[PDB]
């Protein structure tokens, strides 16, 4: 898409229609004459365009109106309203921009931000951008949270996020223009290699891959058409539904065979009933022939009864002889349907042991995508966020994705090595109690107007609590926290001094031995300028490899790589690193997933803020004080970096609208 209309697309916005968001801030416009609505949408798109075409400099309202032309620049307040709404909700002037007008020296309001993960920093920058006082509290000694980059010498390798999924409407696209990230396209070719060490043949790679995708479709059919979504009171998972689909295929494979051979019996028996006719007829023919021969032996001249007997037996013999002839056209009419059927047997198996093992690699890939055993994904909802898929190829950050948080953290008040231990929110404000991670006796008290929680969902899930809420979070929020899913996947970083793989291929697979070990080191990535290969541990493997010695794991990688490339070509690695994200107490997982019994609606609960009760009973209903951001809070873009960012942009807008007022609603 292109024009002002592409700016709306690039901002994840319908260009021809007003969002529920905009109806909220412009109830006059959206309830007014359709002409005004069209005027409004043009100013939105045009403004977005201006920002997008140059996102290194602030888009001031005056700069904006200058470029707008009549009749669109006739109503200065509609332009001011639009530009303000956009700026507030981070659709424009978000990220790292040069500020045309420097920030007011006098701040208003104090916000404490828990965690300097991307969602954290994104709100922090935005709130500071809006004239608020922000401090981020951070347990780690570095920013970025789950954006974690390895660096040593020239070696660079993301332990955390490492891919940008397409700039087609991706906010990272604006970020990349602002920050210099070396964005390198990922070539989608991926050769699998069985446990023996040798490539799957294209014939096989494709007939299994297509079965996988057909199998996925099948589950969607069970889900949406047959409403197979509950089973003995429990909710159905994607994994269960895949078994039931594979079974029903296996069941029909045998079903056809039974129908086939039961055709061969239906014919062997027509044959049998026909041979019996043919034998018994040869015996009537044997007897008549004897009889006619005996009657032709009576020498002539004979009486007429005796001449009748010859002529009669002769007609009678010829009658039976023509019957036995017609019956050997029919014996030779079934002796060949029989031969035909025997050469045309249906399929012997549904899938072979070697089929089902390459199918397991394609499942490992899903287990990777959703950081969890498919037995835990909701069948109905695991893919609820696929309409918002970005367009374009997938990319990697060749210079390490930490370059972005580090960029965002610039200019911000960040207390590192500061672990929050308790959150106190009252009708009159909030205080956050944190400790020094080095020495846990040094204790800190932070008073503030509002708290923004970007605590990972695994942290929030922890029993007993890593962080206490005073007062406790209401049940509607804690229930969503249980219900949701926080999964796990890990990485092994292999640092070599020779490039010994195919450089023109970015990623290649390893097919596992069992279904149980399908995710154990099933995929490798050649993403970096330097000689680094990167190995994935998905599915049920993820959680189990975490209790295994780093060296053993590196050993298995080497083995797998020996099998592929030969025991000679694979050196000892110079530097090795293994992630253990479920182990990390500042994460307790990698990202979230739509657990069975969960829905994308839980993601909305996760973001709804908390309002304390009144201090003095019978005093008016207070302001909300506890706000939530981070990957698990953004329904339409969970479990990603762009989604984290977006939730951070989101909470900064509502915190400002709460504590600074939204003047753009009149």
């Amino acid at each position: 898409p292109s024009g002002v209309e592409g700016a709306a697309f690039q901002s994840r916005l319908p260009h021809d229609r007003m969002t529920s968001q905009e109806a909220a801030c412009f109830p006059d416009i959206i309830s007014g004459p359709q002409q005004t609505q069209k005027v409004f949408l043009f100013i939105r798109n045009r403004t977005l365009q201006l920002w997008l075409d140059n996102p290194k400099i602030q888009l001031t309202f005056e700069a904006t109106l200058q470029q707008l032309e009549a009749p669109y620049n006739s109503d200065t307040v509609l332009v001011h309203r639009v530009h303000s709404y956009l700026e507030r909700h981070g659709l424009i002037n978000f990220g790292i921009y040069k500020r045309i007008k420097p920030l007011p020296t006098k701040k208003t309001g104090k916000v404490i931000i828990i965690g300097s993960g991307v969602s954290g920093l994104a709100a922090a920058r935005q709130l500071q951008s809006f004239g608020m006082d922000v401090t981020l509290l951070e347990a780690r000694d570095r920013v970025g949270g789950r954006v974690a980059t390895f660096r040593k010498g020239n070696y660079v390798a993301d332990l955390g996020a490492m891919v940008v999924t397409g700039l087609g409407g991706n906010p990272m696209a604006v970020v990349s223009k602002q920050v210099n990230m070396e964005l390198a396209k990922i070539k989608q070719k991926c050769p699998l290699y069985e446990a023996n060490g040798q490539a799957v043949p294209k014939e096989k790679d494709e007939m299994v891959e297509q079965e996988f995708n057909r199998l996925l479709e099948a589950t969607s059919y069970l889900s949406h058409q047959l409403d197979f979504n509950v089973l003995n009171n429990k909710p159905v998972s994607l994994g269960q539904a895949l078994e039931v689909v594979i079974q029903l295929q296996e069941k029909h494979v045998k079903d056809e065979q039974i129908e086939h051979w039961k055709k061969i019996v239906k014919t062997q028996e027509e044959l049998k009933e026909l041979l019996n006719k043919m034998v018994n007829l040869k015996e009537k023919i044997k007897e008549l022939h004897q009889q006619y021969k005996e009657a032709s032996e009576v020498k002539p001249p004979r009486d007429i009864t005796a001449e009748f007997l010859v002529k009669s037996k002769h007609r009678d013999l010829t009658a039976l002889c023509k019957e036995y002839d017609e019956l050997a056209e029919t014996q030779g009419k079934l002796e060949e349907k029989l031969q035909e059927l025997e050469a045309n047997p249906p399929s012997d198996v549904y899938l072979s042991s070697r089929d089902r093992q390459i199918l397991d690699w394609h499942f490992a890939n899903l287990e990777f995508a959703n950081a969890t055993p498919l037995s835990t994904l909701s069948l109905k909802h695991w893919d609820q966020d696929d309409d918002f898929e970005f367009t374009g190829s997938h990319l990697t950050v060749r210079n390490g994705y930490s370059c972005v948080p580090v960029a965002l953290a610039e200019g911000l008040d960040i207390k590192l090595n500061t672990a929050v231990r308790q959150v106190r929110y009252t009708a009159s404000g909030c205080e956050v109690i944190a400790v020094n991670t080095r020495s846990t006796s040094q204790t800190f008290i932070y008073k503030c107007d509002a708290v923004l929680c970007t605590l990972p969902l695994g942290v929030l899930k922890q029993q007993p609590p890593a962080v206490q809420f005073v007062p406790p979070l209401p049940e509607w929020k804690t229930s969503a926290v249980q219900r949701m899913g926080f999964g796990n996947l890990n990485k092994v970083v292999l640092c070599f001094d020779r490039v010994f793989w195919d450089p023109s291929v970015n990623l290649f697979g390893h097919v596992g031995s069992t279904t149980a070990s399908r995710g154990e080191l099933f995929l490798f990535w050649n993403l970096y300028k330097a000689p680094i290969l990167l190995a994935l541990v998905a599915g049920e493997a993820a959680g189990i490899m975490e209790n295994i010695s780093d060296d053993v794991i590196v050993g298995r990688c080497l083995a797998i790589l020996k099998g592929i490339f030969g025991s000679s070509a694979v050196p000892q690695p110079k530097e090795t690193v293994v992630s253990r994200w479920r182990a990390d107490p500042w994460a307790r997982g990698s990202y979230s997933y739509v657990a069975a019994g969960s829905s994308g609606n839980d993601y909305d609960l996760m973001a709804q803020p908390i309002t304390p009760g009144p201090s003095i009973p019978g005093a008016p209903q207070p302001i909300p004080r506890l706000f939530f951001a981070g990957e698990h809070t953004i329904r339409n873009y969970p479990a990603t970096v762009h989604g984290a960012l977006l939730s951070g942009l989101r909470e900064a807008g509502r915190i400002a609208d709460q504590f600074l007022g939204a003047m753009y609603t009149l």
Binding site: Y221, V245, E250, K251, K254, K262, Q268, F308, L317
Partner: protein, 133 residues
Amino acid sequence: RKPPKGMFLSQEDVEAVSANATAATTVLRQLDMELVSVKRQIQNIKQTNSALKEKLDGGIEPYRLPEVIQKCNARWTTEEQLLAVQAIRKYGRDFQAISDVIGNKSVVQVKNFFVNYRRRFNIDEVLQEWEAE
């Protein structure tokens, strides 16, 4: 509306595989036995038919007679008339059969004769007595 093609997924089927924890392994093991059942019942009659197939070794070639290529004629000699009556006594109204017995008379005259000499040859008696068998 409909599954991907070749995938088999009927309401009836899905239920029978979920009914209990091993309903899947059960129904799949019932077809394995239903199939071994047929497999050896095929090979049973494959044997029986082989046997029956052998008893017909040689076909019926020793048992054939050459063809009477005989130009059809019009006049009824007494021998041909006498053969007719006897054929009627042993073939009823199956005129084709009679024509093969008498040999040089076609069915129309065979089906004729029947009325020309009906009183003379007492055909009603003859057919009457051929009806008692």
